[PDB]
Each structure stands twice: as C-alpha cells, then as structure tokens.
Amino acid sequence: MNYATVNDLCARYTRTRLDILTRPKTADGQPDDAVAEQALADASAFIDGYLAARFVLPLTVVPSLLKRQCCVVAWFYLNESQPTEQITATYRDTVRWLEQVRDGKTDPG
Numbered sequence: 001m002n003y004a005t006v007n008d009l010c011a012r013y014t015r016t017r018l019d020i021l022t023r024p025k026t027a028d029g030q031p032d033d034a035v036a037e038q039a040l041a042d043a044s045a046f047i048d049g050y051l052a053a054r055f056v057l058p059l060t061v062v063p064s065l066l067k068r069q070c071c072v073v074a075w076f077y078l079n080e081s082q083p084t085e086q087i088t089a090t091y092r093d094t095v096r097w098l099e100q101v102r103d104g105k106t107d108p109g
Helices: 006-013 015-025 033-051 064-078 085-102
Strands: none
Touching: 006 015, 006 033, 006 064, 015 033, 015 064, 033 064, 033 085, 064 085
C-alpha cells in the first residue's frame, strides 16, 4: 500500500524519462502520471505477496529499501513496451531479493 510515489520514481529515474514512457501509452500523446501510479500500486501488490509470508500487512513503517525496490519493479513494468537487458536484470535481482525476504534470509530494511 503503495511503497513509492510518482515523485519517488521521478527522483530516481527523472521525470524526463518517466514522461517518455507514459506519453505513447495515451491516445492524446501527453504524459500520464496515473499510468505510473498504477505501476507503483501493482509493484506494491507484488511486493506484498512476498512480505505476507513474514509480516502482517499493512506494515508500519516503509524502509527506504522497500521504496527503492518498488520503484525498480514499477520501472520494469513501465518499460514492458521496450524492455532492456539492464532493466530486466535489475527486476530479476529485486525478485530474488523479495524471495530472500519471504524465506527469512534477509530483511526489508
């Protein structure tokens, strides 16, 4: 329940690059921050599948580590029209990390 915001995404990737991703998904060709917010919500739902093995949800508080790891997944989601090896690799790293949190090998902060 969301672990990052559109502003967080902008801080990590820039609004320049976010807008480039959301522009082509619309009919009118303008940026659409609601598309990024949906990715962030979807990434948070995905993360909660792993967290729920060990933690009662919703959490208090969100470590800045989960914030980063929500932005990584959301960014992967937002690039699914033109994926890159680098973005895909960051995502797979974060999935492995989530599995480690689920399994008790590491902590979310």
